Structure 1
Amino acid sequence: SDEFDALRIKWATLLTGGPALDPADSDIAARTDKLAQDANDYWEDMDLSSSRTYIWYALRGNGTSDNVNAVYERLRTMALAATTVGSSLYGNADLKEDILDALDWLYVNSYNSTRSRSAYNWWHWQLGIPMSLNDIAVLLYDDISAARMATYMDTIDYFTPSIGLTGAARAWQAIVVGVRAVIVKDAVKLAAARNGLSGTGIFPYATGGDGFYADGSFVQHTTFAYTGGYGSSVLETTANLMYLLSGSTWSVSDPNQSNVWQWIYEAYRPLLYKGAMMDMVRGREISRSYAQDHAVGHGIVASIVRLAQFAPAPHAAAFKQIAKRVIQEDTFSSFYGDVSTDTIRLAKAIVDDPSIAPAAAPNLYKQYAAMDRAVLQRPGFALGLALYSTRISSYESINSENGRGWYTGAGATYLYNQDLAQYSEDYWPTVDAYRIPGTTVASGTPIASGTGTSSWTGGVSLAGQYGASGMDLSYGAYNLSARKSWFMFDDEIVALGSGISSTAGIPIETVVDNRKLNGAGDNAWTANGAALSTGLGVAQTLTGVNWVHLAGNTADGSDIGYYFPGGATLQTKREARTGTWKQINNRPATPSTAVTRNYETMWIDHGTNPSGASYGYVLLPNKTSAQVGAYAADPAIEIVVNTSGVQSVKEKTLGLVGANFWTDTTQTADLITSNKKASVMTREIADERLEASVSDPTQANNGTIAIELARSAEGYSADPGITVTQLAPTIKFTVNVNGAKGKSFHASFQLG
């Protein structure tokens, strides 16, 4: 026994769950059964003949990387079914050998050094297949002759001998080289795998391009917000590799590894809601049926549980508290239902320990300046905002995936409440892709995948408790510009639109909301105190609307109210929509099964070729019909301004004033005066203090932002970057935003 053997065994346990994997545990046993059932299904459908042209008819074609990668995944499942203590296939000789025969046959007829390393899809050949093959080699190590292992490992070395890529691709490379290095016992290669994590897109914070940013954002493919997609993969791989090497001669020593803890607290936590990983950060992966928000969120908690196994104090303890909470929070899909059996074992250990208390739910407003995203987390709900600009692309669509992701990041609002299933349960293949909530578009018209020509995208954060965002809109596919803002307060999100103009000759509309209803599609809903019909297939216009109320899919915690300052005319419809995942993910493996979901869609028609059009609505989560009407009788927010120059909203109760200035000219909105493009929010406590935060959303002002507040102060404290020049009779200061990268600067003034 050497250290390599020790490592190999440690990885085996990570795959199998270990020798102490208790079969009495309801969930552990529930998993060790589906594993065999799936293996027997594959083992039964195999072609065990010696003249076979394929292992599985369903996956024939030794050239289509897609099918071959799937073949190796199946053989991986089978290997697991044969090595997981508790499987009704544990230690089966015929199964082990039938697997090794398949591998040899694949070596000679498909996966070998005679093929191009860069053939479509390079990912399968260099990362996908090797990751499965390495796992099979570890699991069936003892039943693998030297002759066989050579063909397996030599081939993997040919495809991925080194680590030289970035982000996920880089981390994936590390785990390929590392596990193999363990199997063949190459301390040099294992040292290189360890060192790979210090590379671009992983441990070190990115300031541009792919990687994790200091502000919490994550980007991949240069211009896409990807915390929930490639980010998840980077996390999982980095967590698995680090855990593997922890304590060994190759244990990660890079001090930047501590950044990983921050990824959890800053990059992932604010974007999780009762087990769901917000879709706005999952790129093209929203089009994958096997990766809807909760399934993905489960994988993220699985990594947290993994880190909790070796992370230093007090992170391990905190990770455990985080996982425990998410597991209890998610009553939609059992967490133990789709994570590794080893994750179940470790998870249960945390959940059953009384000394471990569930972490508190996040409560904040966060601006992810680096990826044009923003989130509001509160008790009972969460709002995610997806924007795009000259820096972040509208959406990503490659390899025939996410072809209808058009407006998923164009001022799109995502509301999370007690209806944990809203965005799962086949939402993406059935929702109207042209009517993503919160967006302003040319009816039934798409836009291109790419960055915009506007730099003004982002917002300001007030001490991480309240905030405001904005997106200067100007699509390239057709003519349509507008100023769009969102103001996040306690339990109200005010949305404002102005300068809505177009010469496209296409009806222009703004989507107030588009929600998936219950199976019957009969969610009650009301307008101005009057109930509206609940039937499906009914379109109807609501004119002179002050407020609307929609009942959620759950008795409590999922109602949504909508208040319209000044009243509005609403175009709506309630319909059953059918579609297939194949329609948004055109890959042979994608199920073509038809699914039907019900929706209540509401939008404002601005007509064709509007000029200076505008809208203003307030989202009121978790309020009953009675409460929405109560609000309407004395709304807490007050629109200060909604012109193409400035959009401002005031929240009477909290003393909050938010203002988005869109031009480089001196302008005023209530107490706030600005001389440049800026996102500003102030909070006033009568005769106590005046708080203020300011950002340069354009991330391009190389000078300052001159602000003036119509109040007289007695003193102040401020972030460096802010220089105060006057406190009386009015407040005056400048914010040095050169290279601020969209961050907010905070000042606090003492009032007499």
Structure 2
Amino acid sequence: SDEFDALRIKWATLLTGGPALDPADSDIAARTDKLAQDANDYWEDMDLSSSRTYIWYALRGNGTSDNVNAVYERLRTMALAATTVGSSLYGNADLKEDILDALDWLYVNSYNSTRSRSAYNWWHWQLGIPMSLNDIAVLLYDDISAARMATYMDTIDYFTPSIGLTGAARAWQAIVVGVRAVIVKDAVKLAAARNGLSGTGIFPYATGGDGFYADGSFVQHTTFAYTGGYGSSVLETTANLMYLLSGSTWSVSDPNQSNVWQWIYEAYRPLLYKGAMMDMVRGREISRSYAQDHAVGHGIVASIVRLAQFAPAPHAAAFKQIAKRVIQEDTFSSFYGDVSTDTIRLAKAIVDDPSIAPAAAPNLYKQYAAMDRAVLQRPGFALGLALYSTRISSYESINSENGRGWYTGAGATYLYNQDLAQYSEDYWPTVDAYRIPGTTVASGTPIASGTGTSSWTGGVSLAGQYGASGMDLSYGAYNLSARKSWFMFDDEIVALGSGISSTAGIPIETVVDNRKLNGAGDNAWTANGAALSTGLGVAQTLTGVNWVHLAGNTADGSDIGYYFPGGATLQTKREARTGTWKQINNRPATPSTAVTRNYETMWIDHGTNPSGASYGYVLLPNKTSAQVGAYAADPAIEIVVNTSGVQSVKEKTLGLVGANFWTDTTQTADLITSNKKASVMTREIADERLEASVSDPTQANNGTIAIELARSAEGYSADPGITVTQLAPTIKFTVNVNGAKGKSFHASFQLG
């Protein structure tokens, strides 16, 4: 035996769970039964005639890459059922032969060197199919003749002989070349797969274009926030290949591999909430029924479990703690229910180890400047904010997927609480795509997929604890402008809108919220202390509203309060909406089955052709109706300013003042004065200190931002980049933002 045999067996275990796969495990037995179950269904529906024109009638079409890819996926599942200890199909000779005969037929009539490598969909021909075929070849290695293996492997080499792409594509090429190299025992190709991870979009941090960024962001296809979509793929592929190679002659040695650990801590951890990977970073994948947020989150945790198997200290331990936490957290969908058998084996080892304690939940405010995203994580809830600009596109829609993703990244707010199923359970095909929470739009009117013309999109982070974001709105599809800001405190998220103007001749509205309700659609809700009707199919306008409370889908932890400073007129409706995933994902594999979900939708009618309209509301997670009414009697936030020039909010209890300055002119908001476009947040601790953080969201100021704070200081300390010129009678300093790429600069002033 040689080292290649060792690697092949190591990969085989990654696929089957290995020989130690304990069948006495509830979730394992449950997964192995599901596996054998699916295998029999396929094997039973196979056309085994020697004159067949397809393997499965439903997937016929030797030239349809979608179907061909699915055919190989089914064969992979069947191979798994025949090689997974515990499966009732383990070692079945007939099943194995039927699979290999299927591969031979597919080789002669569909997947071979006579087909173009670039025919649609290239991804299937060069990456999808080879990944499935490689796995089958490893699983049934001992039953595959030299003649057969040659047709399988020679074909893969034709479609993908080398690694030359970037990001996820490059990572996929690497795993295709790598696993095949193990099968055929080519040390040259294997070393190439290893080196492949050092390339663009993988190990090295991106500073533009595709890849992981130092600030935690992940971009793919040049202008799309994609941590949970293509990012998840780069993570999974990288983790698997690194694990396969670890300890071997081809173990990864590139020092930049340490960046992978940071992906987990900075790119993923802040974007996961009780098992769900936030949709705002999943791109067009939000339109995939088989990839709803928790399904995606499980895959990410599966990768973390994989990394925990070979990562160096103290990362392996940390990853185990993170995985343990998320597994315990997800009471919506069992983590073990949709991950590989080996992942289950490895995960159970972590969960069952009493010496491993679940990691602490993330608690912070993070600005993902490189992908126009922001997140707030707190006990009991998380808020994700999705924006776009001249640097990041509104949404991606290709290959007939996500055709209604219009406003999913246009000032959209996503609130995560104990209703873990909020964005799953067919939310995407039923929600009104024209009314994404937090957005301002021309009613029932779409926008195009693309970057905007405004550079002011971003925000400021105050010591990674609190923050503020903003987006200068300007759609290309129709006339509509506005300044939109969000201020994130402890349990209050203040949304402000100003300068809302349009000549489009279409009613303009701002969506306060749009929440999926319970099955009966009877969630209790109140306004100004009075109970509101809970019936479905009812539209009603609320005038002079100070506050609204909406009971959640869970007994506790999912209520949401809404406070309206100065009062507001709210348009609302409660309805059952029906749709199909096919409507937002027009692919043959997509189910056309109708699904119905209930919603409570609330928005503000700015009218047609508004001029300088505005809005202001406060999201209050986890407060009872009584508590929202109490809040309204003494609101903890105060709107300092809400003009087209500056939007500012103060949270007296925390001593916080946030301010977004929209123009390059000297303006003042409370104690803060700025001479240019900037996002600023200060925290004052009476007679103790005054903290200040500043950023240039435009990422285009080649000089500085001059700030003046109306307080007298005794001394200071600050990030390099900040130059303090005065401490008394008032504080004055400049922030060098040349090439800052939207980062925040912090200073601490001693008061006195």
**Does the pair score TM above 0.5?**
yes
Displacement after TM superposition at 1:548 (Å): 0.2
Report deviation, 1:89. Answer: 0.1
1:455: Cα distance to partner? Answer: 0.1
TM-superposed CA distance for 1:161, in Å, is 0.2
Cα deviation, 1:409-468, whole Å, max 9, x if unaligned, reads: 000000000000000000000000000000000000000000000000000000000000
Distance in structure 2 (CA, Å) of the matches to 1:519 and 1:174: 45
Whole-Å separation in 2 of the counterparts to 1:409 and 1:625: 30
SS class of match (2:326): helix
For residue 68 of structure 1, report the CA deviation from its aligned partner.
0.3
**2:76 alignment partner, SS class:** helix
User: For the residues of structure 2 that align with 1:99 and 1:243, how far apart are their CA atoms?
Assistant: 28
Which residue number in structure 1 is paired with residue 739 of structure 2? Answer: 739
- 1:214 shift after superposition: 0.2
Distance in 1 between the 2:750 and 2:36 partners? 68
Q: Deviations over 1:527-578 (max 9, x none)?
A: 0000000000000000000000000000000000000000000000000000
Q: How does 1:304-343 map to 2 (within 5 A)?
A: 304-343=304-343
Partners of 2:169 and 2:41 in 1: how far apart? 32
Structure 1 counterpart SS, 2:732:
strand
Aligned counterparts of 1:416 and 1:724: Cα–Cα separation in 2 = 40
Q: Give 2:396's aligned residue.
A: 396
For residues 32 and 281 of structure 1, the distance between their equivalents in structure 2, rounded to whole angstroms, comes to 32
1:69 aligns with 69
Cross-structure match for 2:212: 212
- 2:441 is paired with a residue of what secondary structure? strand
The 5-angstrom pairing of residues 615-630 of structure 1 reads 615-630=615-630
Secondary structure of the structure 1 residue equivalent to 2:427: coil
User: d(CA) in 1 for partners of 2:462 and 2:36?
Assistant: 53
SS of the equivalent of 1:592 reads coil
CA separation in 1, counterparts of 2:535 and 2:344?
43
Residue 654 of structure 1 and its aligned partner are, at CA, apart by: 0.2
Instruction: Quote the residue 2:718 is aligned against.
Output: 718
Distance in 2, matches of 1:430 and 1:233, equals 27
Rounded Cα–Cα distance in structure 1 between residues aligned with 2:725 and 2:660: 23
Write out per-residue CA displacement over residues 116-167 of structure 1, whole angstroms, 9 at most, x where no aligned residue: 0000000000000000000000000000000000000000000000000000
Counterpart-to-counterpart distance in 2, 1:688 and 1:288: 52
1:412 aligns with 2:412: yes
For residue 80 of structure 1, report the CA deviation from its aligned partner.
0.2
CA distance in 1, matches of 2:691, 2:590: 52
> CA deviation digits over 1:625-662, x for unaligned, max 9?
00000000000000000000000000000000000000
C-alpha separation between the residues in 2 aligned to 1:398 and 1:572?
A: 33
Deviation at 1:270, TM superposition (A): 0.1
* 1:14 shift after superposition: 0.2
Quote the offset at 1:41 in angstroms. Answer: 0.4
Identify the residue that residue 245 of structure 1 maps to in structure 2. Answer: 245
What TM-score, normalized by structure 1, do the two folds share?
1.00
CA deviations 1:467-526 (Å, max 9, x no partner) are 000000000000000000000000000000000000000000000000000000000000
TM-aligned CA deviation for residue 108 of structure 1: 0.4
Task: For residues 75-115 of structure 1, give each alpha carbon's deviation from its aligned partner in whole angstroms, at most 9, with x where no partner exists.
Answer: 00000000000000000000000000000000000000000
Q: Which runs of 4+ in 1 moved over 3 A?
A: none
Question: 2-side partners of 1:383 and 1:751: how far apart?
Answer: 33
Q: How far apart are 1:15 and its partner, in Å?
A: 0.2
Structure 1: gaps spanning 5 or more residues: none
Secondary structure of the structure 2 residue equivalent to 1:556: coil
Q: Post-superposition shift, 1:177?
A: 0.1
Deviations 1:382-412 (A, max 9, x none): 0000000000000000000000000000000
Q: Report the secondary structure of 2:324's partner residue.
A: helix
In the aligned structure 1, how far is the partner of 2:604 from the partner of 2:58? 48
In the TM superposition, residue 218 of structure 1 has moved relative to its aligned partner by 0.1
- 1:114 alignment partner, SS class: coil
CA distance in 1, matches of 2:411, 2:37: 45
Residue by residue, what CA displacement relative to the aligned partner does 1:145-192 show, whole Å, maximum 9, x if unpaired?
000000000000000000000000000000000000000000000000
Equivalents in 2 of 1:361, 1:170: separation in Å?
33
| 1:346 corresponds to | 346
Query: Aligned with 1:428: secondary structure?
Result: helix
User: Displacement, 1:262?
Assistant: 0.2
Alignment RMSD: 0.2
What is aligned with 1:103? 103
Distance apart, 1:300 and its partner CA: 0.1
Distance in 1, matches of 2:263 and 2:627, equals: 38
Partner of 1:558: helix, strand, or coil?
coil
In 2, Cα distance between the equivalents of 1:495 and 1:32?
48
Q: Structure 1 CA distance, aligned partners of 2:15 and 2:53?
A: 30
Match of 1:29 in 2: 29
Aligned partner of residue 683 in structure 2, secondary structure = strand
Seq. identity, % = 100
C-alpha deviation, 1:353, in angstroms: 0.2
| Deviation, structure 1 residue 53 | 0.3
Residues 280-314 of structure 1: CA deviation (Å, up to 9, x unaligned): 00000000000000000000000000000000000
> What SS does structure 2 have at the residue aligned with 1:563?
strand
Alignment of 1:159-174 (within 5 A): 159-174=159-174
Write out per-residue CA displacement over residues 173-223 of structure 1, whole angstroms, 9 at most, x where no aligned residue.
Answer: 000000000000000000000000000000000000000000000000000
Q: Distance in 1 between the 2:66 and 2:593 partners? A: 20
Question: Match of 1:188?
Answer: 188
**Partners of 2:263 and 2:535 in 1: CA distance:** 46
Mapping 1:458-473, distance limit 5 Å: 458-473=458-473
Measure how far apart 1:751 and its partner are: 0.4
Once the two structures are TM-superposed, the CA of residue 324 in structure 1 deviates from its matched residue by 0.3
CA displacement 1:223-270 (0-9 Å, x = unmatched): 000000000000000000000000000000000000000000000000
User: Partner of 1:386 in structure 2?
Assistant: 386
Question: 1:350, 1:521 → 2: CA distance?
Answer: 40
CA distance in 1: counterparts of 2:709 and 2:593, whole angstroms: 59
CA–CA separation in structure 1 for the residues paired with 2:31 and 2:574: 40
How far apart are residue 693 of structure 1 and its match? 0.2
Q: Aligned partners of 2:124 and 2:644: how far apart in 1?
A: 49
Q: Does 1:440 align with 2:451?
A: no
CA distance in 1 between partners of 2:633 and 2:256 (Å) = 54
Q: Report the Cα distance in structure 1 between the residues aligned to 2:478 and 2:654, rounded to whole angstroms.
A: 41
SS in 1 for 2:741: coil
Offset of 1:334 from its aligned partner? 0.2
> Partner of 2:404: helix, strand, or coil?
coil
How far apart are the structure 2 equivalents of 1:36 and 1:379? Answer: 41
Kindly state the Cα deviation for residue 702 of structure 1 after the two structures are TM-superposed: 0.2
> For residues 368 and 170 of structure 1, what CA distance do their matches in structure 2 show?
24
What is the TM-score normalised by the length of structure 2? 1.00
Q: Write out per-residue CA displacement over residues 349-405 of structure 1, whole angstroms, 9 at most, x where no aligned residue.
A: 000000000000000000000000000000000000000000000000000000000
User: Is the partner of 2:617 in helix, strand or coil?
Assistant: strand
Q: State how far apart, in whole Å, the 1-side matches of 2:28 and 2:624 are.
A: 41
Q: Distance in 2 between matches of 1:35 and 1:653?
A: 55
Q: Secondary structure at the match of 1:429?
A: helix
Q: How far apart, CA to CA, are the structure 2 residues paired with 1:165 and 1:648?
A: 45
Separation in 2, partners of 1:19, 1:109: 36
